[PDB]
A paper describes a structure:
Rv0315 is a secreted protein of Mtb, and the signal peptide is cleaved by a signal peptidase before the mature protein is released. Rv0315 can induce dendritic cell (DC) maturation and activation via the activation of MAPK and NF-κB signaling, and it participates in adaptive immunity by inducing T cell immune responses toward T-helper 1 (Th1) polarization via antigen-presenting DCs23. The overall structure of Rv0315 reveals that the protein adopts a sandwich-like β-jelly-roll fold, formed by the face-to-face packing of two antiparallel sheets, which is typical of GH16 enzymes. However, our enzymatic activity assay showed that Rv0315 is actually an inactive β-glucanase that is ineffective for the degradation of 1,3-β-glucans, such as laminarin, and has no activity toward 1,3–1,4-β-glucans, such as β-D-glucan from barley.
Residue numbers in the entry: 54 to 241, 246 to 297
The structure:
Amino acid sequence: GGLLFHDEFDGPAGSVPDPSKWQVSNHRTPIKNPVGFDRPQFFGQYRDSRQNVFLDGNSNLVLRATREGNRYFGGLVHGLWRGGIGTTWEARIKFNCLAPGMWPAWWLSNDDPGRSGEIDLIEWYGNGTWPSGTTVHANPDGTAFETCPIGVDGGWHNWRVTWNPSGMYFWLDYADGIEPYFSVPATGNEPIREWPFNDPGYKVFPVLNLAVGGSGGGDPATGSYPQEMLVDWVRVFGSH
Ligand SMILES: [Ca+2]
């Protein structure tokens, strides 16, 4: 009935997420000219290990922050399926990681050469300074963006974006008749607003991650281990 993609994350405790649907990251690319908490000693890695990315046996994906000596690890999964415009994306998430050092996110990525972009449905920052929120990036440099702060607590919540030719609409705990908390219109005058999302054939894939350290996470040495981000499901619906 219009379901294009999902994962309900069913499966035995300790197992890998569905390999036909997700790639588990085994590397977080280092930051160019790093300063502050982007420097290597503060920069938690991604690891394809069941210590950091696993199904819990209760129908959740777990992304877990761990520490081994003075090395820090988080987790990232990258969806192998890509969807275009006229789609509604939603994940049910519990952030058990709203603590210093941590940087969880639920977002959509386009990595096409020359027109990359990203749709950050929700990010929370453990660095004690930046407000949690939602961002649409129309370039990979962070200079063509629309952002909106929204609070994050530790309960189960559904985070949704509907992406159609008119623009992008975001909900927290969507229900019939509720307004989106953030709307980003498609471009309809100089300088021309950067906006690749209405280009023909433009598609994005889902990403879920718990990053440790980096500018958004703050000092991982101040962190608590373990911390976890739980995902009950990711669903993507089309429109007729
Ligand atoms: Ca589930």
